[PDB]
Design a protein around this nucleic acid. Structure first.
Ligand SMILES: Nc1ncnc2c1ncn2[C@H]1C[C@H](O)[C@@H](COP(=O)(O)OP(=O)(O)OP(=O)(O)O)O1
Ligand SMILES: [Ca+2]
Ligand code: NA
Length: 430
DNA sequence: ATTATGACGCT
DNA sequence: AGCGTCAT
């Protein structure tokens, strides 16, 4: 009853760029705009691997992970942009720099948590309170929410998409109590107004379009964001949760897309998030652990407490390359040449990071994969990172892995290496 | 022969 | 520490 928390204390948004790497390339090259197009890495093996796909191309069935040669079978007119190659490897700098553009704009509105290269969470609780003060009881016009969907509406007693959106929005606004500064639904609505403003600023100042979710926590905001893409935002209210979750496959919720989610389904014999409500917190903890059980018990009721962390910069800076099939590294000279290539890219990124961000990495992590292993990483070792010098870092990495070599011969490497990874970590202010 | 990342949890 | 899970 009155002591039952409802997880309505915060306003949280998740902003996610639409087909991000494609937009970066389309901004640069106007010939790619409004076309079926994809971004690919490498080119020799099956036309290259697709890592991003425009919405026009998705209509033909083109997807991430598809080889370009295969994508061309579905979409013969597909246009392609290639990821830059430097020092023999894919180099993602252009996309990292575009990400900084967007993150810096978002940061003007609120503190953000960088969740990935193209998405950020925002805690809008304080901004909403402020805006509610300015509004002074004044209602919120539909004109302020030109790209907002209200999940679950319209409902109750037009056949076009935009018409439906407006009907739902009208029902929502019609029902609002703008006289109460503490009404969670009103807070979410004001949150959505601010997010329209943020999204407009991003598009004005970068050219990039995005989608967003607005709810009371990170998990619902993320879920919401995906409900209407591209170039739209979605508000998921606390009240919308029972219906939304009643047919929502468990795997759709962030963190349940893998083995844990599969075990929830298997052990409990259920399919949808809403079905979780019928178990006690102790029952869930018994199957999935203390932490997971409490989390599931709250989450299936729309409640989640993970904070939006004040962190705009990545915590690690890493460089990685696979060496598949016949290209696996089988000589010491090969291994050393590639560690150097990786170290040179890392040095470049670290030096820029130190100048931009007033910090220095203190640990170097070296990881490899050996041919045969089904695991993505076979071995990981750390050593001190005391100088931003590529030759030193590569020599140091060779030293820490050189004992993985089975070959009785000094010059040969066995089993061959199918992955190298260097990662700078443990930053300190400088 | 997906690849290149990056955060966080366990013991 | 080193490994695993999950995610973009
Ligand atoms: N598995 C991956 N491997 C390499 N790069 C990836 C991978 N997944 C995502 N990326 C890169 C390319 C994407 O443009 C960018 C953001 O990913 P993501 O948000 O999942 O999709 P997207 O921005 O391309 O499309 P959407 O409009 O569906 O969000 O990160
Ligand atoms: Ca995206
Ligand atoms: Na994303």
């Amino acid at each position: 009853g009155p002591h039952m928390a409802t997880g309505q204390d915060r306003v949280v948004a998740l902003v996610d760029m639409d087909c991000f790497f494609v937009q970066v390339e389309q901004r640069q090259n106007p010939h790619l705009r409004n076309k079926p197009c994809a971004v690919v890495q490498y080119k020799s093996w099956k036309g290259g691997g697709i890592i991003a796909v425009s919405y026009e191309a998705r209509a033909f069935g083109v997807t991430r992970s598809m080889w370009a040669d295969d994508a061309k079978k579905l979409c013969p007119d597909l246009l392609l942009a290639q990821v830059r190659e430097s020092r023999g490897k894919a180099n993602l700098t252009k996309y990292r720099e575009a990400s900084v553009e967007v993150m810096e704009i978002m940061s003007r509105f609120a503190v953000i948590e960088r969740a990935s290269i193209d998405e950020a969470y925002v805690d809008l609780t304080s901004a909403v309170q402020e805006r509610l003060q300015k509004l002074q009881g004044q209602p919120i016009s539909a004109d302020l929410l030109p790209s907002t969907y209200i999940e679950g509406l319209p409902q109750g007693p037009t056949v076009q998409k935009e018409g439906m959106r407006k009907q739902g929005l009208f029902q929502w606004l019609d029902s609002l109590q703008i006289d109460n500064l503490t009404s969670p639904d009103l807070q979410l609505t004001v949150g959505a107004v601010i997010v329209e403003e943020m999204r407009a600023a991003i598009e004005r100042e970068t050219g990039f379009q995005c989608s967003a979710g607005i709810s009371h926590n990170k998990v619902l905001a993320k879920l919401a964001c995906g409900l209407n893409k591209p170039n739209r935002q979605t508000l998921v209210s606390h009240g919308s949760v029972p219906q939304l979750f009643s047919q929502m496959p468990i795997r759709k919720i962030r963190s349940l897309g893998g083995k844990l989610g599969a075990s929830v389904i298997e052990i409990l014999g259920i399919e949808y998030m809403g079905e979780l409500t019928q178990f006690t917190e102790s029952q869930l903890q018994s199957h999935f652990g203390e932490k997971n059980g409490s989390w599931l018990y709250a989450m299936c009721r729309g409640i989640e407490h993970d904070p939006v962390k004040p962190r705009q910069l990545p915590k690690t800076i890493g460089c990685s390359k696979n060496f598949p099939g016949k290209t696996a590294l089988a000589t010491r000279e090969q291994v050393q040449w590639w560690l150097l290539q990786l170290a040179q890219e890392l040095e470049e990124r670290l030096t820029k990071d130190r100048n931009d961000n007033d910090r220095v990495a203190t640990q170097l992590v070296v990881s490899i994969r050996v041919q045969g292993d089904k695991r993505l990483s076979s071995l990981r070792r750390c050593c001190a990172l005391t100088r931003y010098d590529a030759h030193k870092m590569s020599h140091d990495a060779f030293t820490v892995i050189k004992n993985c070599n089975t070959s009785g011969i000094q010059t040969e490497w066995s089993p061959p290496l199918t992955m190298l990874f260097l990662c700078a970590t443990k930053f300190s202010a400088s």
